Symmetry: D2
């Protein structure tokens, strides 16, 4: 339902790579207003969460966001933003993901690293 709230679309999934995009609307903007940094981060966390889910037996394990960090580089004002999440490390109890979030003009909006716990 956060995916629904932000109108996210899964553009591509394969083992160790997830691409998720969303429209930059007023509902995800800050007051100034650009795309809220947090909304970008939430898109990124969604991407690597779904990636980790795709790599495990979900009847036995659950992927939980453990650590997230992010640098905000450029602003987004309109159109769409796209998160590309690529796995860096696929461990037994943790996955580490590199995420880049770009705008329509191919500009880096947010660059991010996410650590997902794999829990029983």
């Amino acid at each position: 339902h956060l995916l629904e709230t932000f109108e996210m679309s899964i553009d591509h999934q394969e083992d160790g790579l997830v691409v998720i995009s969303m429209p930059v609307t007023d509902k995800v903007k800050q007051p100034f207003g650009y795309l809220h940094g947090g909304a970008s981060i939430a898109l990124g966390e969604t991407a690597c969460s779904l990636g980790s889910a795709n790599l495990i037996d979900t009847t036995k394990f659950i992927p939980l966001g453990l650590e997230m960090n992010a640098n905000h580089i450029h602003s987004a004002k309109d159109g769409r933003v796209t998160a590309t999440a690529e796995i860096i490390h696929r461990g037994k109890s943790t996955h580490v993901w590199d995420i880049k979030i770009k705008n329509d003009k191919e500009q880096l909006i947010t660059v991010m690293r996410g650590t997902v716990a794999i829990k029983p």
Copy 2:
């Protein structure tokens, strides 16, 4: 407008301290589903961005999220979550914030540090 989307309420503001709460609803949940880690981080980013705005001349300067990091500790399934943002460093071009996000039971859900750029 992200604040309205997440149904946030500013519970308290003073120089260097911001408290913002929001309900844990399905629209901010992960599928499994607990509170989405991204939504929690967005709450934190909202709090320190508002804090920084309160500390600066809103007509000469603008606060932009520059870096955010967060550790997810406990899950939230319902009720309200509350972010408490305390300033660590009030510099000329950067503010650094410590933010703690707790659930109803006073459990630490998410702990976070945010660096806000102060721009002309």
Copy 3:
């Protein structure tokens, strides 16, 4: 033994709290030169690693640094710096620590959060 290299001294340690100091010498400086940010981080990581070791059965488990993040706030040019590590979360498989590093003048040099994995 990085402890020796940097001339670290354990000033206090009790359950969930570690204080470690070290001199700001040329061997830990950047060229310019201030205290190297990395040396400061290494002091912090040392403090929380030790803390975690003190909290667990070291005949069965080992504490491994999993994630570290840090904000450099002020410079140090001389004297001693002191890292205070306080535990935020003492989990079964992870510990999360908050670490503050100050200079002689009680200024914040570096603020840090560290996640330590508890491994068999």
Copy 4:
């Protein structure tokens, strides 16, 4: 001079890219003991500091580490470790760097992202 302590060697520099390596000795180990995560981070921070220095006029400006974060992935017990720092963003007042640190066996030891302030001197 933290460079000397750790016996770091600059293997390669060009605009936006720095490679620095160093031997895994007892003086940079943890007790247990593998390469200390802090020493690994310090190598990384050195790499992006040097990268930023190479991109700016060092007679007017100084590069200061502003924020660093890192994930420790695998351990290093011996031989050499190598930090490759590639620039992500070269702004006027900040640089953002990606750093990867590998061992001899091409294993990721530490992966790292660094924000460097460009300050007037």
